[PDB]
Write an enzyme that holds these catalytic residues in place. Structure first.
Site, PDB file in Angstrom:
ATOM      1  CB  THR A  98     -22.272 -14.267 -16.189  1.00 59.93           C
ATOM      2  OG1 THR A  98     -22.519 -13.720 -14.941  1.00 59.93           O
ATOM      3  CG2 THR A  98     -21.221 -13.219 -16.763  1.00 59.93           C
TER       4      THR A  98
ATOM      5  CB  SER B  93     -19.332 -11.757 -13.100  1.00 62.05           C
ATOM      6  OG  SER B  93     -19.127 -11.756 -11.866  1.00 62.05           O
TER       7      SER B  93
ATOM      8  CB  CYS C 251     -14.509 -17.965 -13.828  1.00 59.49           C
ATOM      9  SG  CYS C 251     -15.873 -18.755 -14.449  1.00 59.49           S
TER      10      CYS C 251
ATOM     11  CG  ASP D 151     -22.850  -7.605 -12.254  1.00 59.46           C
ATOM     12  OD1 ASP D 151     -21.658  -6.748 -12.234  1.00 59.46           O
ATOM     13  OD2 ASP D 151     -22.745  -8.438 -11.321  1.00 59.46           O
TER      14      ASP D 151
HETATM   15  C1  HEM Z   1     -18.608 -15.156 -19.721  1.00 60.69           C
HETATM   16  C2  HEM Z   1     -19.036 -16.024 -18.658  1.00 60.69           C
HETATM   17  C3  HEM Z   1     -18.461 -15.741 -17.279  1.00 60.69           C
HETATM   18  C4  HEM Z   1     -17.901 -14.883 -16.604  1.00 60.69           C
HETATM   19  C5  HEM Z   1     -17.458 -13.594 -17.109  1.00 60.69           C
HETATM   20  C6  HEM Z   1     -17.587 -15.408 -15.504  1.00 60.69           C
HETATM   21  C7  HEM Z   1     -16.938 -14.596 -14.365  1.00 60.69           C
HETATM   22  C8  HEM Z   1     -16.610 -15.123 -13.136  1.00 60.69           C
HETATM   23  C9  HEM Z   1     -16.046 -14.180 -12.052  1.00 60.69           C
HETATM   24  C10 HEM Z   1     -15.480 -12.872 -12.168  1.00 60.69           C
HETATM   25  C11 HEM Z   1     -15.661 -15.025 -10.848  1.00 60.69           C
HETATM   26  C12 HEM Z   1     -14.934 -14.744  -9.860  1.00 60.69           C
HETATM   27  C13 HEM Z   1     -13.803 -15.224  -9.650  1.00 60.69           C
HETATM   28  C14 HEM Z   1     -12.727 -14.984  -8.655  1.00 60.69           C
HETATM   29  O1  HEM Z   1     -13.121 -15.054  -7.389  1.00 60.69           O
HETATM   30  O2  HEM Z   1     -11.525 -14.376  -8.887  1.00 60.69           O
HETATM   31  C15 HEM Z   1     -16.317 -16.166 -11.284  1.00 60.69           C
HETATM   32  C16 HEM Z   1     -16.149 -17.406 -10.493  1.00 60.69           C
HETATM   33  C17 HEM Z   1     -16.984 -18.689 -10.737  1.00 60.69           C
HETATM   34  N1  HEM Z   1     -17.561 -18.983 -12.145  1.00 60.69           N
HETATM   35 FE1  HEM Z   1     -17.577 -17.674 -13.512  1.00 60.69          FE
HETATM   36  N2  HEM Z   1     -17.819 -16.463 -15.117  1.00 60.69           N
HETATM   37  C18 HEM Z   1     -18.743 -17.029 -16.386  1.00 60.69           C
HETATM   38  C19 HEM Z   1     -19.172 -18.168 -16.759  1.00 60.69           C
HETATM   39  C20 HEM Z   1     -19.263 -19.193 -15.709  1.00 60.69           C
HETATM   40  C21 HEM Z   1     -19.994 -20.522 -15.931  1.00 60.69           C
HETATM   41  C22 HEM Z   1     -20.478 -20.780 -17.314  1.00 60.69           C
HETATM   42  C23 HEM Z   1     -19.912 -21.252 -14.753  1.00 60.69           C
HETATM   43  C24 HEM Z   1     -20.248 -22.714 -14.589  1.00 60.69           C
HETATM   44  C25 HEM Z   1     -20.420 -23.607 -15.434  1.00 60.69           C
HETATM   45  C26 HEM Z   1     -19.318 -20.526 -13.839  1.00 60.69           C
HETATM   46  C27 HEM Z   1     -19.000 -20.763 -12.557  1.00 60.69           C
HETATM   47  C28 HEM Z   1     -18.274 -20.061 -11.820  1.00 60.69           C
HETATM   48  C29 HEM Z   1     -17.802 -20.450 -10.432  1.00 60.69           C
HETATM   49  C30 HEM Z   1     -18.239 -21.907  -9.894  1.00 60.69           C
HETATM   50  C31 HEM Z   1     -16.957 -19.740  -9.819  1.00 60.69           C
HETATM   51  C32 HEM Z   1     -16.470 -19.872  -8.384  1.00 60.69           C
HETATM   52  C33 HEM Z   1     -14.843 -20.249  -8.399  1.00 60.69           C
HETATM   53  C34 HEM Z   1     -14.257 -20.491  -7.079  1.00 60.69           C
HETATM   54  O3  HEM Z   1     -14.454 -19.732  -6.248  1.00 60.69           O
HETATM   55  O4  HEM Z   1     -13.711 -21.308  -7.060  1.00 60.69           O
HETATM   56  N3  HEM Z   1     -19.033 -19.140 -14.522  1.00 60.69           N
HETATM   57  N4  HEM Z   1     -16.656 -16.405 -12.646  1.00 60.69           N
END
Ligand code: HEM
Length: 399
Positions: free
Chosen positions: A239, A282, A348, A389
């Site tokens: 992403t 995403s 996130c 996506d």
């Molecule tokens: C522009 C970059 C990114 C976008 C647009 C993005 C977007 C998202 C979205 C839409 C979710 C779902 C959140 C929800 O359930 O409400 C999410 C969850 C998550 N993202 Fe990201 N993300 C990005 C970058 C990252 C990075 C760099 C990491 C790790 C270093 C990461 C790790 C995670 C994790 C672990 C979750 C699960 C959170 C949870 O359920 O507690 N993401 N992200």
């Protein structure tokens, strides 16, 4: 009921269905790949409700969970990490790794993020483009987030390039299943060895924190540490790569706004905020199943029925964002959050890190390369397949 996921209307555009559904049937049924029906939620207010309601579950072994492919159905069999947990298990495990991602920690990381971006830009300069365009994805968009998250986990500098290539193979659209699952096994095996090592001499990295603070006391075991490390790596990396490439392409399509960014790099934060709203890279992560009957708008969602909440649709919601289909880094922002990173407890974990990376990229890229140009006609940009996506596979540039 229409088949879901919908296809994007074109390369850079969301599915056309969402605008029609928001206007005429905001909570509707869609048909998943296995014939089952799920509820699709399209308005910003209802997405926020789905993301926070205590009546809805992320546990994937619950009846009705809306898996979108056959591989997700089998991935549901594995022992879950916190992405697939409800309270109170969710924050119990998420808190083990949240300290590295707080706004304060990300502020402290900013010199390193800037140095990483500076180094990779200078490498690209030295490579030059004297023999044809270079691929901004391969040369810059891919290694910037990969090197950072790998370094945070604890990967030594000499291993970064190989593991970066392996992770890219995982999600590359032209990989065979054998290539992609081999790359996947390669990453898991490496992480298991790194966990064994940090158990014996911890360093200052995320894996060491897990080993010292959780694995050794017995709160989790070493295989859980591997799974958590793997999740932090694969959850957001592709992403991030796509957001970087999409930002460059978007700026190429809006020359007046690129001109503003060139003359005022401090507009990078506002450009990033609008980028994350407009290009919701995403869009299929906010999925639930109902533990009890729940009413959403004018629809009753029965217990054990699945819900998909489109944050992509919510980020174009005319009721919240004026002129939502125009890209405008100078827009005035309403009180409601854009949902590029989700909402509620599961929002996130890396939101602050991701924005800091994106902001560092776009406050620097055009100061380093003021004549950076997409080298192919903008209508020929190689976007991800329309059933996926939004993203960009490769992006030839000159400078
Ligand atoms: C522009 C970059 C990114 C976008 C647009 C993005 C977007 C998202 C979205 C839409 C979710 C779902 C959140 C929800 O359930 O409400 C999410 C969850 C998550 N993202 Fe990201 N993300 C990005 C970058 C990252 C990075 C760099 C990491 C790790 C270093 C990461 C790790 C995670 C994790 C672990 C979750 C699960 C959170 C949870 O359920 O507690 N993401 N992200």
């Amino acid at each position: 009921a229409p088949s879901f996921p919908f296809s994007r209307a074109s390369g850079p555009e969301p599915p056309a269905e969402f605008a029609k559904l928001r206007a005429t049937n905001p909570v509707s049924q869609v048909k998943l790949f296995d014939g089952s029906l799920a509820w699709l939620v399209t308005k910003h207010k209802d997405v926020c409700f789905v993301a926070t309601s205590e009546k809805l579950s992320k546990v994937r072994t619950r009846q009705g969970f809306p898996e979108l492919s056959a591989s997700g159905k089998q991935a549901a069999k594995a022992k879950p990490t916190f992405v697939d947990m409800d309270p109170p298990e969710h924050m119990h495990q998420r808190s083990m790794v949240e300290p590295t991602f707080t706004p304060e920690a990300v502020k402290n990381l900013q010199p390193y993020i800037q140095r990483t971006v500076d180094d990779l830009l200078e490498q690209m300069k030295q490579k030059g483009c004297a023999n044809g365009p270079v691929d901004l994805v391969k040369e810059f968009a891919l290694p910037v987030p990969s090197y950072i998250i790998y370094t945070l986990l604890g990967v030594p500098f000499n291993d970064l390039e190989y593991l970066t290539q392996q992770n890219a193979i995982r999600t590359n659209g032209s990989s065979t299943a054998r290539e992609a699952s081999a790359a996947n096994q390669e990453l898991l095996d490496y992480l298991a060895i790194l966990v064994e090592q940090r158990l014996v001499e911890p360093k200052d990295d995320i894996i060491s924190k897990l080993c010292t603070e959780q694995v050794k006391p017995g709160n989790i075991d070493k295989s859980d540490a591997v799974q958590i490390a793997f999740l932090l790596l694969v959850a957001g990396n592709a992403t991030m790569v796509n957001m970087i490439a999409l930002g460059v392409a978007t700026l190429a399509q809006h020359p007046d706004q690129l001109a503003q960014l060139k003359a005022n790099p401090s507009l990078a934060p506002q450009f990033v905020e609008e980028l994350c709203r407009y290009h919701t890279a995403s869009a299929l992560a906010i999925k639930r199943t109902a533990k009890e009957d729940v009413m959403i708008g004018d629809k009753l969602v029965r217990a054990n029925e699945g819900i998909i909440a489109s944050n992509q649709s919510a980020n174009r919601d005319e009721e919240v964002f004026e002129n939502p289909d125009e890209f405008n880094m100078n827009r005035k922002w309403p009180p409601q959050d854009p949902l590029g990173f989700g909402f509620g407890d599961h929002r996130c974990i890396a939101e602050h890190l991701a924005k800091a990376e994106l902001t560092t990229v776009f406050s620097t890229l055009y100061q380093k390369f003021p004549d950076l140009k997409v080298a192919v006609p903008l209508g020929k940009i190689n976007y991800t397949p329309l059933n996926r996506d939004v993203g960009i596979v490769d992006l030839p540039v000159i400078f």
